[PDB]
mmCIF file of C-alpha atoms and ligand atoms in Angstrom:
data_model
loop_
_atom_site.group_PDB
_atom_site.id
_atom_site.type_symbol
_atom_site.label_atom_id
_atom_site.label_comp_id
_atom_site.label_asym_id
_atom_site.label_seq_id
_atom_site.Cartn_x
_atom_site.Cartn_y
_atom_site.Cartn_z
ATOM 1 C CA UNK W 1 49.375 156.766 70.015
ATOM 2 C CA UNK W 2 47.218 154.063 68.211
ATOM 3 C CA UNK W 3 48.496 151.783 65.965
ATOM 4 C CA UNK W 4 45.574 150.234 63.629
ATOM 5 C CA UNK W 5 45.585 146.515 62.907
ATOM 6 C CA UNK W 6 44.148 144.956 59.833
ATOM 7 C CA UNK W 7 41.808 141.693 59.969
ATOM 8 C CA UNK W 8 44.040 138.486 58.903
ATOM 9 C CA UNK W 9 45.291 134.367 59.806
ATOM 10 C CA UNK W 10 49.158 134.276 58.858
ATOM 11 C CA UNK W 11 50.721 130.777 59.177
ATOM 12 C CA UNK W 12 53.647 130.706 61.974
ATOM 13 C CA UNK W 13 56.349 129.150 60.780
ATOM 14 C CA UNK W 14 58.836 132.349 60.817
ATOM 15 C CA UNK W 15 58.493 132.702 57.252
ATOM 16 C CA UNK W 16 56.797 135.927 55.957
ATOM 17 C CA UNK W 17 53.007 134.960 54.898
ATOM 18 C CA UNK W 18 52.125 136.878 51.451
ATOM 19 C CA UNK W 19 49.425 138.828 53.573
ATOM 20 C CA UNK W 20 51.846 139.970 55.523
ATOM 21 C CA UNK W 21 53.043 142.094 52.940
ATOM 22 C CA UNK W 22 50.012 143.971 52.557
ATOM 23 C CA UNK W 23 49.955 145.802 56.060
ATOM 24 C CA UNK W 24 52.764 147.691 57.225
ATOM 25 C CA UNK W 25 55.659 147.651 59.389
ATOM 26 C CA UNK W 26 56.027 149.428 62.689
ATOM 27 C CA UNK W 27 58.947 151.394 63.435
ATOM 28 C CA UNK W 28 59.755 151.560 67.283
ATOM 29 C CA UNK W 29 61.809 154.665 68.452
ATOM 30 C CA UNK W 30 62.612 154.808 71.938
ATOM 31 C CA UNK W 31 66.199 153.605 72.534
ATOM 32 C CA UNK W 32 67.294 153.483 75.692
ATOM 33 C CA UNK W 33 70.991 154.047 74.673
ATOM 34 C CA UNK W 34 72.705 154.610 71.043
ATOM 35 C CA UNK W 35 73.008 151.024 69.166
ATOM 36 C CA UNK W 36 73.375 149.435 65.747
ATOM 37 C CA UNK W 37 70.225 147.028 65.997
ATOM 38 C CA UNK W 38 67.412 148.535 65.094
ATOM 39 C CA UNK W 39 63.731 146.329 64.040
ATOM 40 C CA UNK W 40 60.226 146.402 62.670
ATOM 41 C CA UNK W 41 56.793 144.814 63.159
ATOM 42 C CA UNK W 42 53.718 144.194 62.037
ATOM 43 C CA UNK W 43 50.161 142.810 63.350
ATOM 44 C CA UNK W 44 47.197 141.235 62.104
ATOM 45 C CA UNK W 45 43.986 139.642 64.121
ATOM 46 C CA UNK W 46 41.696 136.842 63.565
ATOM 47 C CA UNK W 47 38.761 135.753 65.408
ATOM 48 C CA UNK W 48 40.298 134.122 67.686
ATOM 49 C CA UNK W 49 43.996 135.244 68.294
ATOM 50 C CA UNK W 50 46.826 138.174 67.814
ATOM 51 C CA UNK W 51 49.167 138.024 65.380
ATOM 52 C CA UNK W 52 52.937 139.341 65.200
ATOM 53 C CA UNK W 53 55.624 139.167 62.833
ATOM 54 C CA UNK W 54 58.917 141.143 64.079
ATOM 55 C CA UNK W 55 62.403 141.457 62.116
ATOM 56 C CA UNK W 56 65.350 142.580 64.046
ATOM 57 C CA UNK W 57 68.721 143.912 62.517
ATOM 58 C CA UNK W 58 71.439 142.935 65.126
ATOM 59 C CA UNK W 59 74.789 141.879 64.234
ATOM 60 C CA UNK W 60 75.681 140.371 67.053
ATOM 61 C CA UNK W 61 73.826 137.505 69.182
ATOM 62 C CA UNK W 62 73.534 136.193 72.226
ATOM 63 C CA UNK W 63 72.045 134.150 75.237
ATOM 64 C CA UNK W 64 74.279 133.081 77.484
ATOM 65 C CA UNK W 65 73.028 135.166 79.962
ATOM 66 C CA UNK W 66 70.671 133.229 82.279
ATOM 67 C CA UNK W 67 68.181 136.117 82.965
ATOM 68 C CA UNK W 68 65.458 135.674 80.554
ATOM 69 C CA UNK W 69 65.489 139.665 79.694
ATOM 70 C CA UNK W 70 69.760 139.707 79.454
ATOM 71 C CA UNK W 71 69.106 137.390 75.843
ATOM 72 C CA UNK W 72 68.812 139.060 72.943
ATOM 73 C CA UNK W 73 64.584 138.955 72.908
ATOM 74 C CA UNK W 74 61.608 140.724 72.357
ATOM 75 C CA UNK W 75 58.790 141.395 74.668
ATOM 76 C CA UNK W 76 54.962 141.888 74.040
ATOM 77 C CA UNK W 77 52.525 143.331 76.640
ATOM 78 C CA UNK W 78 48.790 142.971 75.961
ATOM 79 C CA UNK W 79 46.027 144.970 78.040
ATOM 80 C CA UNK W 80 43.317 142.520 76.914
ATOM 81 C CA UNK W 81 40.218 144.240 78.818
ATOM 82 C CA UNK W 82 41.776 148.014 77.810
ATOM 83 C CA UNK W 83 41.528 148.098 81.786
ATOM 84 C CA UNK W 84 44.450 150.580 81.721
ATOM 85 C CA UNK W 85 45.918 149.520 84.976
ATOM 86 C CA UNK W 86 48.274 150.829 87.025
ATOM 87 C CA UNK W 87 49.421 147.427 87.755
ATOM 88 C CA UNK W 88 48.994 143.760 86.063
ATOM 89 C CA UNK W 89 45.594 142.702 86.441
ATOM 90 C CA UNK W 90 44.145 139.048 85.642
ATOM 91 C CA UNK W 91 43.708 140.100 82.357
ATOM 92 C CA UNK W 92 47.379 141.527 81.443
ATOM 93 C CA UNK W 93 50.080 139.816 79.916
ATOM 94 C CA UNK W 94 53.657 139.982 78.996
ATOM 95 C CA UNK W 95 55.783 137.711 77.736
ATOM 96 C CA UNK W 96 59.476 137.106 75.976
ATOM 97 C CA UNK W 97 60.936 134.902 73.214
ATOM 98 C CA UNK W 98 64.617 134.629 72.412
ATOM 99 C CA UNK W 99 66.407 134.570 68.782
ATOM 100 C CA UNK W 100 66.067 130.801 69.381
ATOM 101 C CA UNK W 101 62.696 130.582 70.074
ATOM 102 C CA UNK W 102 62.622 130.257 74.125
ATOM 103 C CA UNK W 103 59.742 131.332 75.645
ATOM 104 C CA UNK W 104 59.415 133.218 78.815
ATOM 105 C CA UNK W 105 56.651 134.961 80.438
ATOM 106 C CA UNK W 106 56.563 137.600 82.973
ATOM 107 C CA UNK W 107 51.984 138.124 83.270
ATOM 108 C CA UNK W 108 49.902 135.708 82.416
ATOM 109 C CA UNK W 109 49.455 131.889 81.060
ATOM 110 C CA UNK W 110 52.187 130.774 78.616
ATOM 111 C CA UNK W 111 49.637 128.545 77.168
ATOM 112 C CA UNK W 112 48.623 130.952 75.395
ATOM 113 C CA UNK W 113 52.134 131.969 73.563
ATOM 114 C CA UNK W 114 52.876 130.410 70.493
ATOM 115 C CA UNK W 115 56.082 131.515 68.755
ATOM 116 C CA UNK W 116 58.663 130.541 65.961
ATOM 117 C CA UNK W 117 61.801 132.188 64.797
ATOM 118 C CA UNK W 118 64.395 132.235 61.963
ATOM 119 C CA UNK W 119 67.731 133.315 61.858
ATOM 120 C CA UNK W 120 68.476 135.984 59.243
ATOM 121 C CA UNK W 121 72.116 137.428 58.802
ATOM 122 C CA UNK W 122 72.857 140.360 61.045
ATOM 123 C CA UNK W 123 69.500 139.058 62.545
ATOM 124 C CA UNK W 124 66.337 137.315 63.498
ATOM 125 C CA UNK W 125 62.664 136.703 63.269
ATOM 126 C CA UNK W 126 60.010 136.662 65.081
ATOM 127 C CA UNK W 127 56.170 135.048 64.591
ATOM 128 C CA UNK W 128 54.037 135.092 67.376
ATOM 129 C CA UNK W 129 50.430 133.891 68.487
ATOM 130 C CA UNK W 130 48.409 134.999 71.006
ATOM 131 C CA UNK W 131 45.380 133.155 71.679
ATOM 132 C CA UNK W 132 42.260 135.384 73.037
ATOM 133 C CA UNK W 133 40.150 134.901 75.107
ATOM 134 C CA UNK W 134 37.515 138.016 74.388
ATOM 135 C CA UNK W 135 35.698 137.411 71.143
ATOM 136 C CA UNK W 136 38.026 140.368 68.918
ATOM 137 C CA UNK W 137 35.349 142.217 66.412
ATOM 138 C CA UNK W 138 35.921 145.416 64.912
ATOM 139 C CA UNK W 139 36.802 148.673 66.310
ATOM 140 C CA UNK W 140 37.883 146.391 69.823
ATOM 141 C CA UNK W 141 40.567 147.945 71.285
ATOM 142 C CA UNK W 142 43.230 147.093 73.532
ATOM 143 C CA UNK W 143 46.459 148.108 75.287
ATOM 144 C CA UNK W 144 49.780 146.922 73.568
ATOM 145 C CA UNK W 145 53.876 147.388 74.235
ATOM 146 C CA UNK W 146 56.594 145.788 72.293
ATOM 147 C CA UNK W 147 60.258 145.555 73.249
ATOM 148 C CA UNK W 148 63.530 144.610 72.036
ATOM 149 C CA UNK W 149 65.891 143.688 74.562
ATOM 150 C CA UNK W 150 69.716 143.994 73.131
ATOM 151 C CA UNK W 151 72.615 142.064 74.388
ATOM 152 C CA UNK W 152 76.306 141.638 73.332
ATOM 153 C CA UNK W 153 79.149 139.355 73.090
ATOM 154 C CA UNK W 154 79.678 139.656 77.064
ATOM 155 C CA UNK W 155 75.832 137.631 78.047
ATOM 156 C CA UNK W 156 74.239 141.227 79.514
ATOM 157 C CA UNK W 157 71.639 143.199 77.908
ATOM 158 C CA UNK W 158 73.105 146.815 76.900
ATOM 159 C CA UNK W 159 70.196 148.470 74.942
ATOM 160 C CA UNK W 160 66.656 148.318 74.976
ATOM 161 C CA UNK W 161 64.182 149.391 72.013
ATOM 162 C CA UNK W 162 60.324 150.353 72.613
ATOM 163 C CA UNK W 163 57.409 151.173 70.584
ATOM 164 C CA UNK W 164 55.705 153.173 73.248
ATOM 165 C CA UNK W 165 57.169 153.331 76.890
ATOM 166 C CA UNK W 166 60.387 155.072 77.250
ATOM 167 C CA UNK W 167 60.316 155.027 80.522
ATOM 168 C CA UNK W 168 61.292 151.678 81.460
ATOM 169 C CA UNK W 169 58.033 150.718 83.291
ATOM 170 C CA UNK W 170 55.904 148.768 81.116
ATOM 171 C CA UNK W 171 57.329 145.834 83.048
ATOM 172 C CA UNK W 172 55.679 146.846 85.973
ATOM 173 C CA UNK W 173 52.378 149.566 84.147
ATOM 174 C CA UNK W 174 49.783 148.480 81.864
ATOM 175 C CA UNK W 175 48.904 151.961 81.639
ATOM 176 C CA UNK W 176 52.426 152.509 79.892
ATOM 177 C CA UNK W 177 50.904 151.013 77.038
ATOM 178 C CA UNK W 178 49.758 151.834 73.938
ATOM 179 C CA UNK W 179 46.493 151.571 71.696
ATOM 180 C CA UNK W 180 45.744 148.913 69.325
ATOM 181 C CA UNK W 181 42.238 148.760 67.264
ATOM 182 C CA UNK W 182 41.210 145.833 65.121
ATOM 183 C CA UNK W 183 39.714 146.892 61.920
ATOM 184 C CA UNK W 184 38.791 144.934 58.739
ATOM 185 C CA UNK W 185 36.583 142.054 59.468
ATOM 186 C CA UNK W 186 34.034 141.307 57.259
ATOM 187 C CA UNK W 187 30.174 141.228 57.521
ATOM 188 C CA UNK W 188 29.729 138.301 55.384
ATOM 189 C CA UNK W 189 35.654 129.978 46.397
ATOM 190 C CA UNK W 190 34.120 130.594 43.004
ATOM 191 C CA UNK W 191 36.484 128.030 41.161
HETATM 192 O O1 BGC V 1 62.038 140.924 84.716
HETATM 193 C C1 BGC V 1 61.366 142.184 84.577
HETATM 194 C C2 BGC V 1 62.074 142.972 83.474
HETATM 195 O O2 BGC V 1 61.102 143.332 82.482
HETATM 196 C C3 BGC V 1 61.570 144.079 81.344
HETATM 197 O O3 BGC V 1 60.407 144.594 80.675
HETATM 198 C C4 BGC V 1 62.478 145.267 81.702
HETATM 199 O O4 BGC V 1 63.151 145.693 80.512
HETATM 200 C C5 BGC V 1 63.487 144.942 82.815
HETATM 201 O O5 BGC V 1 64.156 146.125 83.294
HETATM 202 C C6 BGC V 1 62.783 144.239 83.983
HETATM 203 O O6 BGC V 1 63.723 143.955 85.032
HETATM 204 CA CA1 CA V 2 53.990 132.531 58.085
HETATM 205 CA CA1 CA V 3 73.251 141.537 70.233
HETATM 206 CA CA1 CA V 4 44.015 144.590 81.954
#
């Protein structure tokens, strides 16, 4: 499916800009196993980067676990061209942030990955950049996963939440992903 993102420049700090409020949250459904963490997110665009903010309900935190993926994270995937790959080209990317704001990345420059967090209780947040590198205008359209990677009180990841690949591949697929088109950019203060 598509999701539709609205034309904005939220602050990252981890706190929840005001025009955040006026787009809407994304529910993802595919759970790899039954859990009690569950989460939401929401995008916005500007000329020049991506934005997400991400709330996760999840009692229970941890990253002891070495492996990047084994922490309590999320993961975003971005098909920047739309090329709709059956593997990573130079334009894909995927990359992971922790609860405490450590940032890993799996395809493509890090550089590019900017990312604060908050602790909530029972939970965390998540603000991320994305700096682009095609000029975004409206109706552009790219491909886009997101992933929560759950862990518990023994270091190891036990449940996984996506928001379009249930099958475990968008690691390794672009074409696993989903649709994302940027609307809500204008054509064109009064004190
Ligand atoms: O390090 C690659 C990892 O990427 C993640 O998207 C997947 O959930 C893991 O199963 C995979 O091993
Ligand atoms: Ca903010
Ligand atoms: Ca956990
Ligand atoms: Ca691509």
């Amino acid at each position: 499916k598509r999701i539709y993102v609205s034309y904005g420049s939220p602050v990252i700090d981890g706190e929840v800009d005001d025009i955040w409020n006026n787009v809407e949250w994304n529910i993802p459904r595919i759970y790899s196993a039954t859990t009690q963490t569950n989460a939401k997110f929401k995008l916005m665009w500007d000329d020049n980067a991506l934005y997400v903010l991400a709330e996760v309900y999840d009692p229970v935190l941890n990253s002891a676990n070495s492996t990047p993926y084994q922490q309590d994270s999320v993961e975003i995937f971005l098909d920047e061209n739309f090329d709709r790959a059956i593997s990573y080209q130079s334009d894909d990317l995927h990359y992971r942030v922790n609860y405490n704001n450590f940032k890993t990345t799996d395809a493509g420059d890090i550089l590019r990955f900017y990312t604060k967090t908050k602790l909530l209780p029972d939970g965390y947040r998540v603000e991320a950049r994305i700096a682009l590198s095609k000029k975004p205008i409206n109706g552009t359209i790219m491909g886009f996963e997101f992933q929560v990677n759950e862990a518990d009180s023994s270091a190891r990841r036990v449940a996984t939440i996506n928001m379009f690949d249930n099958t475990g591949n968008a690691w390794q697929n672009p074409s696993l992903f989903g649709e994302i088109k940027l609307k809500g950019r204008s054509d064109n203060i009064n004190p």
